[PDB]
């Protein structure tokens, strides 16, 4: 359903480029800003570089009025060192459960990543803002 | 009902204090972050001073399983100008009507207020970040 | 029921104090080590300071033959930073559902928390050692 | 049954090699980490040397849903003096009894052995961590 | 029943004090030496200090003609090390089950404990001499 | 019956040899240590010398499940003076009476004999330890 939705805002608070890779929604669909009807392919975001001091928004939502949440993953990768992983992000806003999942796995000591705004209790996964900073 | 909820994050990006006044939840209830069960009173935020660079979170939602949504109002005022009104904020996430409502009124010209993150189509109102600054 | 149980061993490997807060067993009961009959109150651990190199054990389990499992939450906070939250811990070993749950949330970046030993497939949740360190 | 299980973690807290010998499970079966279905022969551990400052894990469990616990023995032996015994370890997590057995017999004044985490009251035998150190 | 009885003779062969704690007869009753009728309270031994070369006798047995056996537990602890536990002793001479039980648990390494004289096949548990020494 | 039993431990606390003579069980049978089924003839102990600083154990018990106790005698004799008597020991743990008998008769001023652990009230005769000393 559209009631299962998530907004992921990648905000570069540093001065080095960061790339988005392997963006894939296994359940649900990526869509446009403020428009859950305008589906957009993952190619619009995969390979994109979030320049420092600007934000990139990824909107995911379940199929219209369906019994399906939205589940997806992407990598944030530093292009300055041959596209090594910074962190692996996984989100899951299911339709038939209360516990939403927002996992940031991986290790990269040269990068610091913060995130806020997620809701894991019940309902939608909300607007998660992720501040990325290369030290 | 808990399906209708709203989070308001007032962020005083400016360099002078801003005060909350007349906070009132006409429908639903306020609560502590992460716990819709832990109801809180409006007095916990009434008259509070948001210092520069400080963030203040107000969480509202419907009651336990009731057919009510949530609705409330408050004011941002300037403590340094005789509590002159800066802005008037109204939020409404109804349970019956699908469309939500987030309205900011006022005409104070020595202030900049920028609100973002609201959802108006269907479901909960969501998380709204309100950046405040005094010119 | 006693078949569902959990042991949590907080080990402050770091060099600065860490405080327990908001310890609450919503289901089942806490008890003294080695004696599930000897129930203990949450106040015996609330506000306790885990000094560096000190180990603190919290034992929870279901009640006497009841169909309940066990479930609880607590917080690690930093006494040296105005009780700023370090982490939020949630444990659940249900009697009905087979799968257990051990969740650690939070975004404190000047702390390292490492938990190991939990069992999530079936049976009791087990023993979980949580090594804490402040950067 | 799988409810009868034991994890034995040999952790070398010294600076001399220690060997595992005569590992034998009379009842139950040795299995993989976090996988009670992947049975492993005792040859995977017999004769292995636990290098200082690293841990070796032995997982034993009863037959699937059977009326059988897990009973076994092994020797820890110092290879520096012609494979003499350090200690003899015996574990018994039966299915038709409450009292689990964890016996560390033998004598070797040149070695100090500590162990913790066992449960002898009822249920599984738990995760026993054994710290070994040659003096 | 008086047919089930146990005598425990703690003998501090070492040169430093050892303290009794948590003495508890869950079944049967304690009594004065040579007189099973002369019941005594656990407080007569709780917290007692066994000086070096001193011997302390604890006599337990079933009640008057009751079908109960006897069962109890206590702890030896080190008064010079903040009452750190030395050993945990459990005794059981059941009236119904033929086999008795005498269990000594603990992992204190700066102490030597040697118990002898128990009978485990049938009848009363007997007399058990427990020589204690601190390294 | 096996319920009627006695253990006699001769412990040389001196520095001179002592001999056991005329060991004879009129009722019951001598048996092995911890094995009431392994009957042993009196020739195994008669004429034996208990070297200083070591213990010799004599186990007597009634016939299996019979209406017969265990009654016996022996001499402790000093071999240094032509096998003169030190003391004459008589034990009686009857099946059809409550009063057990443990008599140490005879006179030898050059020897000091202590004994402890006997029970004369009811039941078995217990484990009697006899410390022998030559002055």
């Amino acid at each position: 359903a559209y009631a299962q939705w998530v907004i992921i805002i990648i905000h570069n608070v540093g001065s080095q480029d960061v790339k988005i890779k392997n963006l894939k929604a296994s359940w649900g669909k990526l869509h446009a800003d403020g428009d859950k009807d305008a589906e957009v392919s993952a190619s619009n975001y995969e390979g994109k570089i979030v320049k420092p001091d600007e934000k990139l928004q990824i909107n995911a939502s379940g199929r219209s009025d369906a019994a399906e949440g939205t589940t997806g993953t992407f990598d944030l990768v530093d292009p300055a060192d041959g596209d090594k992983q910074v962190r692996h992000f996984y989100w899951d806003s299911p339709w038939g459960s209360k516990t939403n999942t927002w996992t940031v796995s991986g290790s990269n000591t040269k990068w610091m990543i913060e995130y806020s705004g997620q809701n894991l209790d019940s309902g939608a996964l909300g607007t998660i803002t992720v501040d990325t900073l290369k030290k | 009902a808990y399906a209708q909820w709203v989070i308001i994050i007032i962020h005083n990006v400016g360099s002078q204090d801003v005060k909350i006044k007349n906070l009132k939840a006409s429908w639903g209830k306020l609560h502590a972050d992460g716990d819709k069960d832990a109801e809180v009173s409006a007095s916990n935020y009434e008259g509070k001073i948001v210092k520069p660079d400080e963030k203040l979170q107000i969480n509202a939602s419907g009651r336990s399983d009731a057919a009510e949504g949530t609705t409330g109002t408050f004011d941002l005022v300037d403590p340094a100008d005789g509590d002159k009104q800066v802005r008037h904020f109204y939020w409404d996430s109804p349970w019956g009507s699908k469309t939500n409502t987030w309205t900011v009124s006022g005409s104070n010209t020595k202030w900049m207020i920028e609100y973002s993150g609201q959802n108006l189509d269907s479901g909960a109102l969501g998380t709204i970040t309100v950046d405040t600054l005094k010119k | 029921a006693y078949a569902q149980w959990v042991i949590i061993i907080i080990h402050n490997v770091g060099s600065q104090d860490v405080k327990i807060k908001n310890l609450k067993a919503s289901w089942g009961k806490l008890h003294a080590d080695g004696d599930k009959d000897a129930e203990v109150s949450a106040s015996n651990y609330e506000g306790k300071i885990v000094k560096p190199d000190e180990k603190l054990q919290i034992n929870a389990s279901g009640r006497s033959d009841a169909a309940e499992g066990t479930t609880g939450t607590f917080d690690l906070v930093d006494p040296a930073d105005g009780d700023k939250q370090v982490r939020h811990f949630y444990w659940d070993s249900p009697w009905g559902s087979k799968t257990n749950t051990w969740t650690v949330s939070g975004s404190n970046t000047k702390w390292m928390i490492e938990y190991s030993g939990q069992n999530l497939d079936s049976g009791a949740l087990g023993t979980i050692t949580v090594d804490t360190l402040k950067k | 049954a799988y409810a009868q299980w034991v994890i034995i973690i040999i952790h070398n807290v010294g600076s001399q090699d220690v060997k595992i010998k005569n590992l034998k499970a009379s009842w139950g079966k040795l299995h993989a980490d976090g996988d009670k279905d992947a049975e492993v022969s005792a040859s995977n551990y017999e004769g292995k040397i636990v290098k200082p400052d690293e841990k070796l894990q032995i997982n034993a469990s009863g037959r699937s849903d059977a009326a059988e616990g897990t009973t076994g023995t092994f020797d820890l032996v110092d290879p520096a003096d012609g494979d003499k015994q350090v200690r003899h370890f015996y574990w018994d997590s039966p299915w038709g009894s409450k009292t689990n057995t964890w016996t560390v017999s033998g004598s070797n004044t040149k070695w100090m052995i500590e162990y913790s985490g066992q449960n002898l009251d009822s249920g599984a035998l738990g995760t026993i961590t054994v710290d070994t150190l040659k003096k | 029943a008086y047919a089930q009885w146990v005598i425990i003779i703690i003998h501090n062969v070492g040169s430093q004090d050892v303290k009794i704690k948590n003495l508890k007869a869950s079944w049967g009753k304690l009594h004065a030496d040579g007189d099973k009728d002369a019941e005594v309270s656990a407080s007569n031994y709780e917290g007692k200090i066994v000086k070096p070369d001193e011997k302390l006798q604890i006599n337990a047995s079933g009640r008057s003609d009751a079908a109960e056996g006897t069962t109890g537990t206590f702890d030896l602890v080190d008064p010079a090390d903040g009452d750190k536990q030395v050993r945990h002793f459990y005794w059981d001479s059941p009236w119904g089950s033929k086999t008795n039980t005498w269990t000594v648990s603990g992992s204190n390494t700066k102490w030597m404990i040697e118990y002898s004289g128990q009978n485990l096949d049938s009848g009363a548990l007997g007399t058990i001499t427990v020589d204690t020494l601190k390294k | 019956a096996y319920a009627q039993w006695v253990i006699i431990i001769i412990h040389n606390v001196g520095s001179q040899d002592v001999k056991i003579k005329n060991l004879k069980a009129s009722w019951g049978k001598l048996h092995a240590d911890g094995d009431k089924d392994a009957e042993v003839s009196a020739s195994n102990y008669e004429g034996k010398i208990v070297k200083p600083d070591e213990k010799l154990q004599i186990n007597a018990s009634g016939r299996s499940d019979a209406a017969e106790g265990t009654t016996g005698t022996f001499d402790l004799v000093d071999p240094a003076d032509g096998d003169k008597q030190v003391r004459h020991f008589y034990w009686d743990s009857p099946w059809g009476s409550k009063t057990n008998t443990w008599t140490v008769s005879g006179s030898n001023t050059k020897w000091m004999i202590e004994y402890s652990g006997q029970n004369l009230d009811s039941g078995a005769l217990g484990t009697i330890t006899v410390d022998t000393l030559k002055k």
């Binding site: 290790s107 000591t109 | - | 060099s15 390292m112 490492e114 360190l133 950067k135 | 010294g14 600076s15 | - | -």
Partner: protein
């Protein structure tokens, strides 16, 4: 008294190099600042 480092090995009371390791009177030392190394607690070492 205090000593400035942890021992990486087995401390030998009576043989070198452990026989010559010494601690200092408290007035000889002042508190320092750590400098951590290693990604994990199992391999975390401070450089005072």
């Amino acid at each position: 008294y205090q000593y400035l480092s942890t021992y990486f090995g087995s401390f030998a009371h009576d043989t070198p190099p452990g026989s010559t390791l010494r601690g200092l009177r408290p007035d000889h030392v002042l508190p320092g600042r750590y400098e951590m190394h290693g990604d994990t607690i199992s391999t975390a070492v401070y450089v005072t």
